[PDB]
């Protein structure tokens, strides 16, 4: 059962996270009336080069599932795991985190890498 | 141990064959003839001052002068350059009314030209203007008593006058890939036109050839090495048009010898018209000489290859064009901004077996031309103020030969071709493109770990 | 010994997996008309980032040597080793994978990496 | 502390060289007049994807701060570690290293993981 | 009388559409480049500046 491309849609979070290598392997796969195509082709990798910028510089480049050295804030709508790996999917999830994204996002750059990457340079050296 | 894997490499020697578009290069020094863009130069990345070139050895790809799309691209390109630099400046539109045509000013002593009359419209929209001019025979033809002729191409198309600072005189450009894509040259003596190049070597950047409009020869260019090159696309096909690479150097010094005078016509507002104005003095026609020594050894080189290109006994034979248009019975060529037409027929004329001055032909001065075969567009070349002169390494040839004939008793050799593909296919016998595939694969017998 | 730039095109592979790093340098080399370059530049990271997401996705991530976990199922290009990287160059093995290079990468980014980097979240919950 | 970008420049090179992951998250983000934009942003990642490669083609492949094993000279500005590394500013330790920083990277790909990487490979072929 | 152009040049009238009033524009900068501004008040021009921004 190979149910083609993002079709673990409305599926579990767990079995979504599976086909990593389907979203994102076609992120890059590889006169006028011409016009269209060098304008929209412009477009790809602006929202594809913005993936290979950010997991680079958070505890990833390594591409695919890569971990983090952070704190969930708690502040954050924390629920029970057997009600969230169990039973979500990623398309409810990320419906939560909307209406305060903007102020989560700010730590796994501004604390892990910059401070757990600077416990590597309080690491090596003498 | 032994049974094999998957070893990943990046930054193999690896490339594959694939056709896609190149970017201008053309030295530093030829940056400088500029007249508001000749050709192509503005944000262009001038040559890397010393375009370094890679020696390769066992490097083996299949060359082709015929089917090869660097000549495809070529021969578009320079259409669309010439059209561009044609397509902001003065239409003629009131030029092709009908002009009144009679034997040029002169003590007769016949002329080719005349002395030829018509109105016009000056900065004032309302009055018009009486002023004469002076044309070839070529320019104008009789529309139907003195005779009456119209612009030549009034029965054809629209017109267009050039901005008279374009020099047209060939000019050195380079070619380099961007990355990704590399350049490969063919670096062979022996080269038949078909089958694997001996030599490859590969660059960023590529020599300098200049972009010589000439039909039937060829010149300005690159010369061949040691024994006269005898190339064709297949040497059984007549129908295809053949070429030629010369070895030793023809010198030539083509020539309008009149001190031309340049006539301002106000026919705007704003608009102008160069006009062909007195010719200073002693009247002679254009031409182009040529040294004795140099021609009479082409005859004798080029000849011993031919009998290693059919049969060692029989009889070879060579006449001029019989008919067509002068693009291919004389030679076309720029000579100083206007279009040269020399009679071809003093050399198409020999016979050869198994076994201190100059000379010069007789050239026609040509202005108006409908080149490129860019149905839509002819135009006129301004006029050239003081003696033209232009001089080159003869290094080229385009002909054809009959048919069955008497089998091995003779055979004959006469002039024409005239597509500018084939003259394209004059120096781009040794380029073709490749793209970089830096990801290779092998079977060791490694593994990473998990 | 060092030969420049694609000096090593045609000598045996072992002497060919020598200048893996040359050949990463011209990867990316740095009105109308401005068109003819604007338009070529384009295509230099077109023949890098097409490696650059193959290599990210597998074990490979940085770029020259990378080892990979595909057994070269016999019923491909059986070869004996000598067979492959002693008596050949790029270009003679490069060729034998042509049979099978369409077949030989359902496996690399489809059955290694998706599936090698979702038990690297069963195993790291500990 | 979150001051903003770049006010370390006439300050310590570890100040300036703390914050390692602020720098790199505002660069791509996610007719004519049209054209000046655009003839900008294409010749903004062939350069940044030069380096992505560099990166890749060194032993480094990760991302952030990597250390090296080549002999800084001591032609160039020798002071003590503690009278470069915890003393100077990039506005005045840049002010010396400037004249010879060509000579440094006639290396950083020649000598050491051209020959490195294939190293790994005469070894892991036998 | 004639129009003044007409012993020299052509000549294009423009759109009354078109307004003319000077609106304001930002100059930009992307991803290698900046643009500096030294934010000295008795600023002539020359030299380095002290609390350069």
Redesign the interface.
Known sequence: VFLGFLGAAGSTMGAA??????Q??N??S?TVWGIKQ?QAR?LA???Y??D??LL??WGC?????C?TNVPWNSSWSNRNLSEIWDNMTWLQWDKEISNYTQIIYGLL??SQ??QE??E??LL?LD | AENLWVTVYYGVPVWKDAETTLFCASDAKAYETEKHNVWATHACVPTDPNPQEIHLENVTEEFNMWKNNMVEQMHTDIISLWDQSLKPCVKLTPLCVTLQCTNVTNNITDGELKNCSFNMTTELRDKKQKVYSLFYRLDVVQINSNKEYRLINCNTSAITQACPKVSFEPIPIHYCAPAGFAILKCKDKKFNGTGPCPSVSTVQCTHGIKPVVSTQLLLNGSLAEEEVMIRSENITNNAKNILVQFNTPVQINCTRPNNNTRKSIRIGPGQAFYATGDIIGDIRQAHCNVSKATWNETLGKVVKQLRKHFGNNTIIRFANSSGGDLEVTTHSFNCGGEFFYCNTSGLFNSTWISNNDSITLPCRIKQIINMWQRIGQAMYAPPIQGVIRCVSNITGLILTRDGGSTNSTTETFRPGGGDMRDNWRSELYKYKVVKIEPLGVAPTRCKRRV
């Open positions: 996270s599976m086909t990593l290598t389907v994102a392997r992120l890059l590889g060098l412009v990798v602006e929202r080069l913005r290979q910028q680079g510089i480049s390594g591409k695919l599932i971990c750059e501004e890498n910059q990457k600077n590597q340079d090596a």
